[PDB]
Design a protein around this ligand. Structure first.
Ligand code: CA
Ligand code: CA
Lengths: 585, 585
């Protein structure tokens, strides 16, 4: 076995506590090099001649190139040292520890998780563990008050095709007026893109962090939304853009006028004076050469304190969480402290980040609760929509992203299909609803938090920005109530099947030919196996089902009962059909 | 090449800044597996059509199983994305990125270091980079004040062989009287084991954090010691026992008297009252069943604040840093805040921890400045002392550990040859002074901060505790002035050769048969080579030396001037003789 491909670390995503006396440990190895992984451990202060504890690490999954083994160590003393006993195909015994590899245990040394502090056990809000988030782009969701529509607002019709500068008048009132609809669907939370006062159309260049932009509504209106949403069981998540402020931001304005003599000169990253010029920026800004968005020096305590105050303000209005924008550019110190604050005001406030790359440094538990799961979108798009990859490959990408962070994070990653910055998934599937349904079926049964982009639930289509931001279709006649009802059912099943919300994920079957993928969600004794026939052909499949997990299963989508014989389940899936088999326990 | 054995991450010890605009990158792969590692990178927002910047990753070293490539990235934007270009022994090329591996650059994906904030750049005290520390065992260094000796103190003589309950009267006053000696030796700091009010002999069970143990002196004397030491260019480091307190601790005693009625019961970990019993305890303690050492709940704001105040008090007295004890058992949050307090009070205050296992998590730059290099000792014991490992193996251990943490930490690790909890190194050398001397030569020229155990410089000997805690030999005729002068010369050389304090390390030669090891420390244009012939026989060797690094060398220890001919250097070493070649640049 290739010893240089085996990996572990007493930290990060490979060693972390799930409670004060339970330590989870993961081990990576060349796919196929290890067939049996066991952990021998003991208290760190245990006598040398003491009997070691045993814990078998079951194989948690495999990806494109590696195998991952996982074990749960019981540590009543909250202190543990451990060494891996890896067994290969030809029965070779190799010990693995901090010192390195060796046929003799003692020479391998041992890994150590010094101590488990409860304040360091990754914890996220309970409602978010079984939530269903709904993204709302205010300007295009619903116009509840025409009195606030800016000049040039265009007609609200299904045949309307937005342009970069188009205006439809969507506002908060609109949302309040539609909560009944959103309640019917079963969404548990609403996620709003920036909606704070700004002079631009997109509102990412914050003019006043303490006020709702006039075109969307006012503070009194926002409070009404918060409450009305709250009694329907819907939480509110606001989008915070702390990485940079807008060029209308009061503090920035003082710099544009007082320059060097500005009480806030150190609140930003300014090269030299005069403070500005057209087409040329002499101060750091968002991305590259964007004068409207001067970068904020979050490292500056005064800046820190203001942003925190901004945070305090809106949490006082009763919001439930924040989706951080371009957070990976704000110092960790800030986020570590932001968390501390946000949680102190409301232990149940959610903190979701947006980072387009391995976000581990932010998902250890002392910073964000989760991040947008773009890896999930890439995988479902290339698998369900374009077909660039087959089911077995789909399985790989899926497994790899999953082993990225600790389980507490994986469970609350937002699984999006699209957003206001990309084309609508139905478009991605080329108008093929049969494909859309299977992907939605997956989205609703996989590990993570399902996020629905406004309108997709009733069949809205569209190209990328700005064709993805078309006016919400409210004409019951123009809506795909068929698809809508589909979401309802799925959201329903996900709320009653504890396994779909808080269970683990283990691949069940993968076939590059049949392009059929199946996985099993498990929590306690309940098992729910999802089978995806991503192929336009009626197919039969024989699945392995060890009798231990049950002898009878129910397909929650058809009520059809399927029985297993001698460890096998014969399933017949119509073109692009998905099955949700509950073990009834 | 075997891709499953190649490793990298956009964080930790494999990706970190060294400046606000410079990012170091490390990559490892199977030994011999890769021949060229290039880093192609650009700003995170750079246009897809722009050319990528190139960066050559030199092989920073290699251990028993891996090769380590390291490169430096120039990021003027403080934002960078990059991909690796790896070539095998057969010229086959492949890109390595976050996405995975591919012959195509784009399909490899790209690693990303989102942003480099100045507050996150690992920064350690400048004086610590070129320091030489002397570990003082208060009770056994010098007795300047007979009136404060503990009852039953024994005669201070060379033939004395300490026992567990022995006493000799060493105290702070003694250290003061001997400050001239330390100054002559050349030490720039003193490390004191615990010296705070405690009922026991060892003083690890803190009774009073704010007072010096009467047998050692009092605050006035401590102030005097700090001042007399400072004027001599010597700093003061105290040992902080924050993981647990003594059972005589004002807080613990209160709970002991009032049980659940005490306002300090939540400062400890108690399962049920009343609180007390011998060999058995109803409260968590350091290690296993140690009544006199109840664990402090450092997670508690009150407990946190007290120790932080305790710190303030001593720093107000003028100390230069702390040695944390069992630091790996207190929460990280505590340690991060400790650092902020400490540096705000004195940016040049050192924070050294003691972890007996991979300490990376505490060495990212937001916690400790470095830790004791227990690894160094291990390699030195087995290499120079017992000879259990040969020069090539020694090479591996040394190299592997070097790559364990970020260069800023690696550079300041405390490299000890022994301690008060171990036998003296000379004894480990079975009394062989040649074996001992050669080790000191390596210690005084290798990467990290040399830590001299009191008396080792004059040839003290002894088995592990308590025989290593014999009273310091002060009678000049009874001291080994040869050894002493040896340390002095090596210590003086280390201060003049910038390479020896601020230079990197590269293996120069490793011969398992001749048991000769050589390395070179480099900074700017200066190169200093160290050749150690760890054999009791006269040996001759041919070292490589391309004319680029010079053709002339000087043995700083002997003054002998050697010359390289045709890129080769002829060296003749005497038994256990070491050579320090300075290229005079
Ligand atoms: Ca409106
Ligand atoms: Ca004394």
């Amino acid at each position: 076995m290739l010893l240089e491909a085996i990996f572990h670390e007493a930290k990060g995503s490979y060693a972390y506590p799930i409670s004060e006396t339970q330590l989870r440990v993961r081990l990576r190895a060349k796919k196929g090099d290890v067939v049996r992984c066991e952990v021998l451990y003991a208290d760190r202060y245990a006598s040398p001649e003491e009997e070691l504890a045993h814990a078998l690490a079951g194989k948690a999954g495999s990806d494109e190139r590696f195998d991952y083994f996982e074990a749960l160590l019981e540590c009543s003393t909250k202190r543990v040292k451990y060494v891996f006993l890896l067994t290969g195909p030809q029965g070779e015994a190799v010990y693995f520890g901090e010192t390195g590899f060796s046929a003799e245990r003692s020479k391998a040394g041992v890994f150590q998780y010094a101590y488990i502090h409860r304040s360091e056990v990754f914890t996220t809000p309970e409602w978010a563990k079984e939530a269903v988030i709904y993204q709302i782009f205010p300007e295009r969701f619903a116009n509840g008050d025409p009195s606030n529509d800016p000049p040039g607002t265009e007609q609200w019709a299904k045949d309307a095709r937005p342009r970069h500068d188009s205006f439809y008048g969507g506002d908060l009132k609109g949302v309040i007026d539609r909560l009944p609809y959103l309640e019917e669907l079963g969404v548990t939370a609403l996620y709003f893109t920036p909606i704070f006062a700004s002079p631009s159309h997109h509102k990412y260049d914050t003019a006043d962090y303490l006020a709702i932009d006039p075109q969307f509504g006012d503070l009194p209106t926002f409070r009404r939304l918060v409450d009305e949403a709250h009694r329907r069981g819907i939480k509110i998540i606001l989008d915070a853009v702390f990485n940079h402020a807008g060029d209308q931001f009061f503090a920035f304005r003082d710099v544009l006028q007082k320059g060097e003599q500005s009480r806030y000169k150190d609140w930003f990253f300014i090269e030299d004076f005069p403070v500005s010029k057209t087409s040329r920026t002499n101060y750091e800004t968002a991305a590259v050469q964007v004068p409207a968005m001067p970068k904020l020096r979050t490292e500056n305590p005064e800046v820190k304190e203001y942003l925190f105050d901004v945070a305090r303000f809106w949490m006082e209005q009763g919001i439930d969480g924040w989706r951080l924008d371009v957070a990976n550019e704000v110092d960790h110190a800030f986020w570590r402290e932001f968390r501390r604050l946000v949680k102190s005001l409301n232990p149940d406030a959610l903190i979701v980040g947006e980072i387009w790359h391995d976000a581990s440094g932010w998902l250890m538990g002392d910073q964000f609760d989760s991040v947008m799961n773009y890896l999930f979108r890439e995988s479902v798009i290339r698998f369900f929509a374009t077909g660039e990859i087959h089911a077995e490959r789909f399985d790989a990408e899926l497994t790899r992203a999953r082993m990225l962070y600790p389980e507490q994070a994986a469970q609350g990653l937002w699984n999006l299909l699209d957003s206001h910055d990309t084309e609508r998934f139905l478009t991605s599937c080329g108008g093929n609803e049969a494909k859309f349904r299977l992907a939605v079926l997956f989205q609703m049964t996989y590990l993570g938090t399902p996020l629905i982009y406004y309108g997709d639930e009733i069949g809205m289509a569209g190209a990328t920005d700005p064709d993805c931001r078309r006016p919400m279709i409210w004409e019951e006649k123009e809506q795909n109530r068929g698809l809508f009802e589909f979401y309802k059912e799925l959201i329903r099943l996900r709320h009653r099947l504890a396994s779909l919300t808080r269970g683990n994920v283990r691949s069940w079957h993968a076939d590059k030919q049949a392009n059929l993928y199946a996985f099993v969600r498990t929590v306690q004794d309940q098992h729910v196996g999802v089978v995806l026939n991503n192929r336009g052909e009626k197919q039969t499949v024989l699945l392995q089902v060890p009798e231990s997990g049950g002898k009878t299963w129910l397909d929650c989508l058809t009520g059809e009962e399927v029985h297993g014989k001698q460890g096998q389940l014969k399933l017949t899936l119509r073109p692009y059909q998905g099955m949700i088999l509950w073990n009834g326990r």
